[PDB]
Chain A
Amino acid sequence: KXXXXXXXXXXXXXXXXXXXXXXXXXXXXXXXXXXXXXXXXXXXXXXXXXXXXXXX
């Protein structure tokens, strides 16, 4: 019969897709990003005049 086929060595992970079904990419479990990214500004500080301490 044509039923006989030997594995020989290994599968080596085969990739095949045809049906897909709704694609499905993003679901996971999380609903929200939560507060998003924190506000951070970049401008590079010049010198900053006068120290905070009593002795200057």
Chain B
Amino acid sequence: XXXXXXXXXXXXXXXXXXXXXXXXXXGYSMFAVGIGALLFGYWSMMKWNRERRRLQIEDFEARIALMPL
């Protein structure tokens, strides 16, 4: 009996298949989150600066109140 190297292909490994595809981001939907984070960013920040004004006037009031200084 002769024994040589046997042939096997099975699945053929798929000859040239695309793996690159669009994922997560679509296009217009990313701008809704992108610019949406900006509008949420300013509104949250400016409310803190209005709360800073409560401290600001109260800080300068200490100088006016102190005349024996």
Contact = CB atoms under 8 A, between A and B. Distances in A.
Interface residues of B, number: 4
From DSSP, what is the main secondary structure of chain B's interface residues? helix
Nearest to B64: A11
A26 interface: no
A7 B60 CA distance: 12
Nearest to A13: B64
B57 interface: yes
A9 B61 CA distance: 9
Nearest to B57: A10
Interface string A1-37: 0000001011100000000000000000000000000
Interface of B: 57-58, 61, 64
